[PDB]
Structure formats: C-alpha cells, structure tokens
Amino acid sequence: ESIRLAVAGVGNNISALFQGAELYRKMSAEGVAEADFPGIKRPRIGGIGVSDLTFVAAFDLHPNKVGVPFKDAVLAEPNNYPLLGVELPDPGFSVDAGLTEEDADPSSPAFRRIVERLRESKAEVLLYSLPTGLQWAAIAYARAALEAKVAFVNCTPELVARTPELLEEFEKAGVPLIGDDLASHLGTSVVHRALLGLLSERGLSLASSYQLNLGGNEDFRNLRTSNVEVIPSAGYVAHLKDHKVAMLNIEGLGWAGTPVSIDLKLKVQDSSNAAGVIIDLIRIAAAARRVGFGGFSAAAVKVLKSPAGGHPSYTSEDVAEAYRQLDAVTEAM
Amino acid sequence: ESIRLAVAGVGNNISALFQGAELYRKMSAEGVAEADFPGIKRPRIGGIGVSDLTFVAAFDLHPNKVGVPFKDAVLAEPNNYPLLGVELPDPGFSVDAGLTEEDADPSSPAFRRIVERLRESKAEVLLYSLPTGLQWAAIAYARAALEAKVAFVNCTPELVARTPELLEEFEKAGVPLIGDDLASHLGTSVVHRALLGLLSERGLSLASSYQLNLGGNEDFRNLRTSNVEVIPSAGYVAHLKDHKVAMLNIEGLGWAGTPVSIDLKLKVQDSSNAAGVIIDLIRIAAAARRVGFGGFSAAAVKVLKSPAGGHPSYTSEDVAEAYRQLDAVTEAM
Amino acid sequence: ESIRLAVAGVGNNISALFQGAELYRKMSAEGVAEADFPGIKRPRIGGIGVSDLTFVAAFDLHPNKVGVPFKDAVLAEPNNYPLLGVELPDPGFSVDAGLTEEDADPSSPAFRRIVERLRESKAEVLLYSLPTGLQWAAIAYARAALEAKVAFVNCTPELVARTPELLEEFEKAGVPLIGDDLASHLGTSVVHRALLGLLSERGLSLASSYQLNLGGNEDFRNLRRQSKINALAVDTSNVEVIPSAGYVAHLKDHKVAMLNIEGLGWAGTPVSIDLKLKVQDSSNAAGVIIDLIRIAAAARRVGFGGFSAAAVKVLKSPAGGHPSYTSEDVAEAYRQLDAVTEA
Amino acid sequence: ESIRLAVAGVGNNISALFQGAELYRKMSAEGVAEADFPGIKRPRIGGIGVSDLTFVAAFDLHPNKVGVPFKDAVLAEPNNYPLLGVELPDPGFSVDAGLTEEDADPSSPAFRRIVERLRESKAEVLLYSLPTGLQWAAIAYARAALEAKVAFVNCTPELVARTPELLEEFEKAGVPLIGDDLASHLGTSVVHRALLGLLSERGLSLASSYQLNLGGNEDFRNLRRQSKINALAVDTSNVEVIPSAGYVAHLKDHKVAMLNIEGLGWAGTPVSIDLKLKVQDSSNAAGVIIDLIRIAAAARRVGFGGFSAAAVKVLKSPAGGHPSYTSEDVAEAYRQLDAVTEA
Ligand SMILES: NC(=O)c1ccc[n+]([C@@H]2O[C@H](COP(=O)([O-])OP(=O)(O)OC[C@H]3O[C@@H](n4cnc5c(N)ncnc54)[C@H](O)[C@@H]3O)[C@@H](O)[C@H]2O)c1
Ligand SMILES: NC(=O)c1ccc[n+]([C@@H]2O[C@H](COP(=O)([O-])OP(=O)(O)OC[C@H]3O[C@@H](n4cnc5c(N)ncnc54)[C@H](O)[C@@H]3O)[C@@H](O)[C@H]2O)c1
Ligand SMILES: NC(=O)c1ccc[n+]([C@@H]2O[C@H](COP(=O)([O-])OP(=O)(O)OC[C@H]3O[C@@H](n4cnc5c(N)ncnc54)[C@H](O)[C@@H]3O)[C@@H](O)[C@H]2O)c1
Ligand SMILES: NC(=O)c1ccc[n+]([C@@H]2O[C@H](COP(=O)([O-])OP(=O)(O)OC[C@H]3O[C@@H](n4cnc5c(N)ncnc54)[C@H](O)[C@@H]3O)[C@@H](O)[C@H]2O)c1
Ligand code: NA
Ligand code: NA
Ligand code: NA
Ligand code: NA
Fold this sequence. Notes:
The structure is a homotetramer.
Chain A: E1 3-8, H1 12-30, E2 53-60, H2 70-73, E3 96-97, H3 109-120, E4 125-128, H4 135-147, E5 151-154, H5 164-172, E6 177-178, H6 188-201, E7 205-215, H7 218-223, E8 228-236, E9 243-253, E10 259-269, H8 270-290, H9 316-332
Helix pairs in contact in A: 1-8, 3-4, 8-9
The complex binds nicotinamide-adenine-dinucleotide (4 copies) and sodium ion (NA) (4 copies).
Protein name (chains C, D): Five-membered-cyclitol-phosphate synthase
GO molecular function (chains C, D): inositol-3-phosphate synthase activity; nucleotide binding
Binding site for NAD(+) (chains C, D): 10, 12-13, 60, 65, 99, 130, 132, 141, 184, 219, 281
C-alpha cells in the first residue's frame, strides 16, 4: 500500500524524491529487480517499496509554486535539481499556500486550511522540507500534522523531535514524529570522519585537517581536533546548482614523524543526498502510523544528525531491532 | 629491557627503524612523553618502549653494506629513506655476509656462521627484511633463527608462519614465529577499502573504482568489484625515492542513479609505513620469547596481511586478549 | 557542398566523427547557431561546415565491422565511444574488406578493389585511421588514394606526408596530402608543457615532475612516449613521463592524466601543483580531424595539392617540420584557402 | 656593493626577504654557484646579487615589533613565515615607530623623525610593505622617501607610482619610484589564466570554472578580487572567483588554490581539469621584491629616476599601464640598466 504524502516545502529535495520515485517505477517496467536499484539501502520497509509514493498535498509560499499543479511546481525555478528524463505522472492536485509567520498559532485560518487539507487528502506523512532557520514553521506544521493525526518528518536542524513536550504529545496520540535533521546519504562529513577514524585507529598523529564545501542552490544560499578547521560555506558557485563539491586535506604524522598527506574531492547531487535518506524516514513514518507506533522510531537514527534522545543513547542494535519489529509487525499486522 | 635485534636485509625499512628509534630517544631527552609520540599505536608492549632497541647483528649481500659498520651500511646507497637528522649511535658491529641461494641448506658453512652469529650476539629477534620473491631465503633465515632459539619476524609475502610444518617446529621450541607480510601503517589499500566500505554501508551502488601507486625505491623496483581495477605498480618514478604516491577514483551511484564521485591522493614515507608496524611485531616477538610463548601471536594479526591461521579465523577481541595476556604475563613474569 | 569521405579503419575516431556530425546537425534544427557550437575553433573552412560530411566508403579487417552496414559498424564492438543519443542516419553502404599486409603491393586484387571503391564512391578524402605502428598500411592506403586522385589524411605517427618523394608525387598530381600524426584537441602534453612553461618563464626552479595517463580503448591497448618528454624540453633530469600507467577497462574511450610539478621559489620553499585531466579521448581526435578533412577537401576543390600549412597547429609531425612554420604561415593558408574558394 | 634597505612594515614579506638573503649567503659558502640558486630568475641586476642586502631601517606599529632589534622583530608574532634554519645575522639596529594616520602630514614629529632616519641610515631604497588598503600611508612613506632622496617600492595596490604628479616629482628629482602592486612570483591567477588560455586558443568551449584560495597569515586576514576576474578576460558568464574561501589558521603563511575548469570539445563531450596549488605566500612576494629592490637601487646609483620598465613583468599596476609595454621594453630596460652600471 502506497504512502499518501503531504509536503511542506516544494524544493530541490522534493524534485529529487518525486522524479526519483518515477525513475525507479520505470526501471521496474524495463525489468530491473529492486535488489539492483542504485542508491537504495532498504528496498522494502514494512512492505513499502521506494516507488510506493503518492503525493496528495503540498504547501509553498513561492509565486512560481503556489496554485501551480504539483508536477510543474516541483520543476519550477528556482529548483535546479536536474530533469532526470522520465515522464512524471500528474497526481491531480495543485500546491496549496503555506503558513506565513503570523499564521503560526493553531487558531489561525491558514492553520485551519492545512489541518483540513491533510484530513481531506487522507495524508499519512507530512514531509517538512523548508529552509533551515524557521523554528516557528517546524513547530506550526508539526501541530497541524499532530491535530490531523498525520506522521511528521523533520529534514531540518530545527528542534521538533528534540523539544521534549511536543514529542510527549505525538507519543500520546499514536502518531510518529521522525526528527531531527537529515544526515546526507553520503556527505562531506561522513567521508571526512571515516578518514580521521582510520588515522587514529592505526595510531597515526593528526597535524591538521580542513574541509570546505561549494554549492549553487537555494539551500546553500540560505545557509551562507586542535587544528581541524571546518568551513561548511566556502562559497556560493551559481553554475554548480544542486551539485555540492567538498575538498578536504588531512596531514597525519607516521613513524618517526614522517608526513602522511591525504587530498580528497567529493562531488554529489546534494538533493539526492536528501532523497536517499527521506525515502527511509518517509517509510519509517508511514509503516509506524499504520501499526500505531507513535513518537520517535529508533529505525530513523542512522540517517539523522539530531535524532530524539541523541546519538549517544543508541547502538546500531537498537536501530536494527526497530527495523525488525516494524517489518515483523507489518507482516503480522 | 632493550630488544637485542638481528636483521636479515639492511634496506629502507631498517634505515627507517634504526633512525626512527634514535629520533624517539632524542624526543625523550627534549622532554616529550611517549603519549605524545607521533605515529605510535602502542607506546609500550610487555614494558618495551619504541626506543628500547639494540642492533646486535646484520646480514646483507650488497657490497656497499657487507663488512661496513652498521651505522654506515643502513644509510648506504641504494637506501633512500631520508636522513632524519639525528646523531645515530654506533652500536659497535659490522654487517656480516648473508646467505646466497646455494647456502640454503642448514649444513652449509654460511648457515653455520649465521646460527653462530645469532648465538654470540645473544639476539632475541631476527627481522627478515629481504626483497619479496625469495622463498628459499625466508625458509633458510627462519631455520637459522629456529636452531639459534631466536624469534623470527617475516615482513614479506613469502610463506613462513603460513607453512604449517615450520610453525609446528617453532611452537615446539618455545620460539615465537611472527608472520606473514606487513600491512602498511596506513597504506593505499586500507584507505581504498574504508571508502568502499562507506559506500555500501550507506547503500550507494559502486559503478567503478581504480587505485594506482608510484614509487622510486629498491622495493618498488623489485615488485615492478566487477569494475574495481587495482594497479599496484603504475610506474617507477626515481625522484620519489622511498615516498609512495597513490591516486584513487570511486564512482558511486546515489538516489535516482545520480553520481557520487571521489578523487583521492595519498603521499607517505613508504618505509615509515613498514617501521610503524615492525616496531609492534618486533616487540610482540621479544616479549613472547622472554615469557616462552612460541608459535604465532594473535597480537600480530592487525598489522599483517597474511597472519598464520588467516584473517577469517580472528576477531579483534582475539587480538586485544593476546596484547592483555602478553603485557599481564610480563608485569607478572 | 558536402565532403564525400572515405575511411581506412572504423574505430573510436570515426564513431566520434560520425555521431558528432549528426549531433551538430540536430543542434542546427533545435535552433543553435554555428558560432555557439561547442568545441568548434573554425565553424567553416572553404565554406564547409562541421556537419557537411557524407561517408561513402569504409575499410576494416575486424569480423564485427566487415560487411556490416556503416551505421552499425561504427558502434560495433570493440568501439566504446559513447552513444550520443542522436538518430544516426543510414548512409546506405557497407564496410568493405581492407588491405592485409600481403595485399600491400599495388597489383594485389585488394589494392585494385580499393582503388575501384575510391573512384566509384567519388570520395574526395581518404581518412587513414588505423592503429599506430603499421608503416606498410599508411604507405599502401596512401598510394591507393594517390592512384585514384583522392586527398589523404594521416592521423598516425607513420611516415607518409614526411617521405619527401611521396609528397612530391602528391604535390605534382594536384592532390592534397595532410600529415602526419594528430595533435589531440586538448592533450595531456600541451597542459603539462604550459605549466612547466609558467614555472621557467617566471624563473621558478624545477625539482621534479611526473605525468601518467590511463585509458580503456583499443588505441591505448595498442600503444601499450619520447615525443612526450621532448615536448617538455626546463631541467628534465627529474621529469618522468609514463604514457601508459595502466589500462582501466571501465574508462572505455575516456583518457585520464594526472600530473605533479614540484618547483622551488624564493629561499627554496616548495611550489606544488597536482592536476587531473579527464577527456573523451576520441573527441580529442574528431575535434582535430574535422579541421584536417575540411582542409583536405577544400584544397582538392581548389587544386592546392601537397601539404597545406593550415594543418600545422593540429599535427605532431607536419611535412617540413614545425620549426619551418609561424602562426601567420598557418593563418595565411586558412585565409587564402577560404578566400580562393569564395571566387 | 650592498643595498642599504629601509622597510615600512616588518611582515611575512620581510621575514621571507631577510631569512632568504641569509639562506643564499649560506649556499654560497657550502659551495653552490648563483646560476644554480633555486627561484632566482636574474642572479644579478646592475651587479647586485640576491644576497647583497643591508637592512638599515625598519618602521612598524605592532608592540611585539616596535623597539625590538630587527633580527627578533622579523620572526616576532604574528609573523608566521617559517624559520629557515640559518644563523640570521644581527644588523645592529632596532625597529623605530612608524607613521599613524594622524602623523600623515609632512610637518608632524613622526614624519620629520622618519625623514631623519632615512637620511641618517643612508638608505637607498624604502620598501613599503604595509597591509593593503592604507592610501594615506603609501602616499606618506612615499613623500618621506622623496624628501630624503630615497628610492620607493610599492608592494601594495595603493596609488603611488600611478599618481602622475608624484611620479613627475620623483622623475625630476633623479629618484626611482617602483610600483604599483606585486604580481606574486607564481600566482593563482596566472595558472588559472594560462589553462583558460589553452582551452580557447585550441577552440574548446568553456562551460564553467571556479578558483578558490585559502590562507592563514595577517595579509589574508586583512584582505578578508575584481583584478582576479579581469585576468581571466573566454566566456566568463560562468567563471567564479572566491579570492577568500576561508582562513585556515594551521596554513600560516602557506596559500592553497583549488581550481576547476569544465570545457566542452567535439560533440559537447566534457574536458575536465581539477588543480591544487600550494605555495609559501610570502616567498611569492620576496621572489619578486628581490627583483624590484635591485631595480630600485641600481637605478638610483645610475640616476635613472621615475619608473623603470624592468619592473613591469613583476607588477599588477605599473606606472603607464601594461598595455603601453612589450617584453622588449622590459628587456631593453634590464640590458641598459646592467650595461650602464658596467661603465
Ligand atoms: N541533502 C540535503 O539537501 C540536506 C542535508 C541535510 C538537511 N537538508 C535540509 O533540507 C531542507 C530542504 O532543502 P531543499 O533543497 O529542499 O530546499 P529548497 O530551499 O530548494 O526548498 C525549500 C522550499 O520551501 C519553500 N518554503 C519557504 N517557506 C515556506 C513556508 N513557510 N511554507 C512552505 N514552504 C515554504 C520554498 O519556497 C521552497 O519551495 C533545507 O532545510 C536543508 O538545509 C538538506
Ligand atoms: N612499507 C613497506 O615498505 C612494505 C609493505 C609491506 C611489505 N614490505 C616488504 O618489506 C621488505 C623490505 O623492504 P625494504 O624497503 O627494506 O627493502 P630494500 O629492498 O631496501 O632492502 C632489502 C635489503 O635486503 C638485502 N638483501 C638481498 N638479498 C639478501 C640476502 N640474501 N641476505 C641478506 N640481505 C639480502 C638487500 O641488499 C637490501 O639491503 C620488502 O620485501 C617489501 O616488499 C614493505
Ligand atoms: N586522442 C586520440 O584518439 C588520438 C590522438 C592522436 C592520434 N590518434 C591515432 O588515430 C588512430 C585511430 O584511433 P582510434 O581510437 O580510432 O583507433 P581504433 O583502435 O578505435 O580504430 C582502429 C581501427 O582500425 C581497424 N583496422 C585494423 N587494421 C586495419 C587494416 N589493415 N585496414 C583497415 N582497418 C584496419 C581496427 O579494427 C579498428 O576498427 C590511432 O593510431 C591513434 O593513435 C588518436
Ligand atoms: N604573496 C604575497 O605575500 C603578496 C602578493 C602581492 C602583494 N602583497 C602585499 O604586500 C603587503 C605586505 O604583505 P605581508 O604578508 O608582508 O603583510 P604582513 O601583514 O605580514 O605585514 C604587514 C606589516 O605592516 C605593519 N604595519 C601596520 N601598519 C603600519 C604602519 N602604519 N606603518 C608601519 N608598519 C605598519 C604590521 O604590523 C605588519 O608588521 C600586503 O599588502 C600584501 O597584500 C603580498
Ligand atoms: Na537539498
Ligand atoms: Na620499504
Ligand atoms: Na581514439
Ligand atoms: Na605576504
């Protein structure tokens, strides 16, 4: 059974998820088994395929996107995720207007429209995909979803699954709250840290390290160990669009203080790094709501920077246990 | 108590170990604690410091090195490990002549001289540091060491700790046999494999990868997953000397088949990559002979490519247990 | 007015040229002006556009290519230039059998058949695009072309335009002979050389440099160099070229170059350069072939036989040698060739 | 015959120049001929060697540098050019106080003291090596130098040699004025520009390029660019320069450059270039200062006041502008300067 998905923010991430889902649908037609799908960690989570996605509802504020049909809105400037060259289906609907800051309060009429629209579209999951920095919106879309009984997924660093009192409510309603903050499918950081891990595991000394990142999309434009230096915003480069380039240097010291030098360059489709992980959180969301597991799922920990309860309080057994019980409860029901 | 060390082959590795040991001795004088030593995994193994090294005996065949005083022999052309700029001590002795292929047999007089020289120098460890490819020599130096009751350490890919019947003998005499084949302190391979590990751990698809290596020393000159390609001998480059340069490419595929590109360059002092690991094997050797633990030590597994018993049959608990019992038996005695 | 173009060897280079020409034809329709064509230094040469190409004749020895229709032969194994995603047209002919070493001699039945095919197909230019190392074939296809009055283009390091008596005969017969040896559109060695140029021009001292190349096509597999190390002469006592570091199957027709330069500046402090170059190796051919084949055809139309100086900048080994030619020699030949075609 | 050299600003550049000069002095002893000196384009300029330097005078405002003996001041925080491991000599003087913005005016007690110090120290050249952005100081130290008849060298982008009336006065007084703005021995922008040059010279199309720089010294911290993007003009609608990507403390006086060039060749196939440049940023200064200060001194000894054309290749903003000078203009000035010194 397909996930009925609502979207708060129709950016590069949603362009990647929407086009992505129909590329995998096309590969199924062509004759590719999901075992062989590129970029897919779990091809099934509670029986949900990577392609078992229906968009039912969408909220933006941007004039190119509000009261545009969804199909057209996702591809609309200033979105610069590439055309993946797949005839995308028209899912029948038009992007509703989002909450402005003044409509934060659950008693606003805007608020009332969103709650009514989630109820009427029979959404299961609301995907929060806004610009980073809007704490009022993350809270607001989450109470909207909460009141509507719809699972909430926070892609952003805003406190939602991390505000202890809002988690309690979600726990109490049998509603899943997945957050906070996407860990990129394969990001600068996880590569940088693996290499520094290698140096100290084998007993090399770190003299210094730097990592710097370049991007050309709205996300990047918005955001813009003694001798480790991290520059998460080295420069906006318009021609890079939704690509992100990272360059890192490690200077280690080996036997006798001889230098170990590492020079590394990473290029990725930045919003594929989002999609690669949203498609897991989306499915942990839906499968949990269907089986009534409200609050935070430990299945979501490995693909989140700031999960409810914090990384320190979780082993990868906790994670694998949660996938096993979520999948085994669904098989059962 | 200092390790009395014999050396079969006075190459770049021994230049690195000999100079290295006196650089750490100098840092102790200057006022550096061994906690803060660059490139040192275990600063103590059975009470042995990285600087608790006495060369007592040496075998080569090269005219620059045979019947030269050791101090001068290690630095002698065609050795191109750098002068680390430390006044090295003169350990009093001269490099004896090695075994030629015809003197393989334990009944040769050459053989008799080596066995007598290990006995007279009261060596504890014989370090086998010859060119790769000389199976007759690895066997011969090992029987020489065996008869002499002296621990044997194989840096090379030749079968020694891996020939089942020769291990049995070493087991039976209470003599340690550490082998086979050094894993570089931080080599091309361990970096390449960690990065490929990252791609499949997170569920990225590998499209291709290549790794190529460049060197300019005698070792390199001697040696000279469907779409992974490893070129361990991309080219001899004389000006690189004992430096080794590695370049690797990984092309992954992410969500929706978007490319993940990685480009990496590693430069190291290749024979510091040997020294960084010999200094551990050397000490597992000595400490085991002092405490009468003959045969293979599991402590040696993490720093060997082809350990006796094979990597598959060892967990890092086996390794850490063996360090704990070796150190705890020495404290005890 | 389209070049009737004959091909000795249906390799990566002709996959690139044929598909390339139909990609530019497509861009013409979909709207793009030829001044905006990517990778074209000169969009017309004696009024011949980058797309004004009719393949009339093709010669190979590989069983996947012989008696296969051209359209299919160019894409056929082990050719691994990419599919460019253009409706490649069917020119309506098939790859005939080439000369094997024993058919070298002009009175062989092969030789007579080829001189037949060049005359019958009304070819204007024969493009010699065989593997490097086949001196008998370069000579043979060249005398084949001469006999039938068809212009000859040598992609390879083989001696053809450089043998003064064969040049003389071509010169006197009113037939163009263009060679020898393609200088790649953008080659490893011009990049390495330019950077070394910079260091010594501003007086930085060279400690050391290396260049290594990686490839995965039949050309690279065949080559498997002195020209490269001359290029860089600059103290070269510590400059190493590895022109074949290794064959990487999944690169196909891609070529990768990696270079290191270690300078010393004031007080012997290091100036370090690390560079990676990636290119479509056979685009580096076709980007220069399209120049030479048009230099060829327009010259035969205007009866300028022998070597054209317009060919010099895109050749390693032009007839008469680089030292006997300036930029103006090359320009004078382009301007004269274009302007005579005019009248 | 040694240059008596005065310094306005004891930064990384003078750490590099002072230690550099004593490293070459050491190499002379330990045996090395000056033609084998690393990083020296011209080992003599009017018979002045790379080591023929007497520091006589020094002016700063930083408390670690003022009233400290020169020897100690050059190495003093926050100067982070390396120690080169040479016995640096003690020239026997101490860093005097510089001009603060209020002491600009020539009748201030500071100004009078400095004109005192230049006359008393018998300085021949005043090297202006302050931070970029201080137009009042460049003018002030320049009139200070003029009044005392001492040659002036402008390292900075400030208008000095380029203000035509100050030039006129220097010209007429028989005093050399050399400026403005050092072109680094080997700079990011000449590498980027050379590579972009290659692509368009051979007719490859630019899709896109970026250049970013990293540093860790006071110069880089101060700068924290238009000149850079002009250099590269070549379709630059997709060429981005970030001249200050970020300040990395553990780089100190090192500077790192990273560049990307994305060309299109035949049939729009990509030509990709990735480059890393590492240099000792203040060696890139001293490698050119040693040229300018000798151009300065030899010209004052021979009474060639005003701007010398020999200075052109090592300056961004020479008096009269690059467009009014050829390579021969520069050569003619070097050859004349050396040869007059002779007689
Ligand atoms: N791989 C990654 O992209 C990565 C990594 C970690 C976290 N994230 C985070 O994911 C988020 C989404 O990034 P993206 O590339 O999709 O961003 P984007 O900037 O392209 O999309 C944001 C969308 O939200 C819309 N919007 C703004 N205010 C709104 C409102 N009040 N209501 C509804 N819509 C509103 C914008 O108009 C736009 O359509 C960002 O916060 C980013 O930092 C992404
Ligand atoms: N990091 C590394 O260097 C690394 C990695 C893994 C394994 N290894 C292996 O370590 C070994 C030693 O490398 P190296 O750099 O010291 O080598 P090297 O080639 O510099 O030294 C070899 C020495 O052995 C001497 N020799 C040759 N035949 C001899 C004989 N019969 N008896 C005695 N001496 C003899 C040679 O003259 C020379 O002095 C090589 O087999 C290498 O492959 C090294
Ligand atoms: N960047 C470049 O690609 C570049 C640069 C300069 C020069 N060149 C040279 O151009 C030549 C062609 O390059 P390519 O990649 O197209 O090579 P290729 O290997 O792809 O093409 C060679 C073709 O010749 C055919 N052939 C072999 N023997 C023949 C014979 N006797 N008669 C007729 N056909 C025969 C082969 O089957 C194959 O079809 C090579 O010599 C290469 O070095 C290429
Ligand atoms: N590669 C290069 O280093 C390079 C290239 C071209 C131009 N330049 C320019 O040369 C100049 C010097 O470079 P640097 O790295 O030596 O700089 P620095 O910051 O190391 O030196 C500046 C010095 O000026 C001193 N000072 C400040 N105000 C003063 C005043 N009013 N009077 C006297 N002294 C004063 C500062 O304390 C410091 O000692 C900078 O403008 C730089 O841009 C450098
Ligand atoms: Na994004
Ligand atoms: Na070695
Ligand atoms: Na080719
Ligand atoms: Na500087």
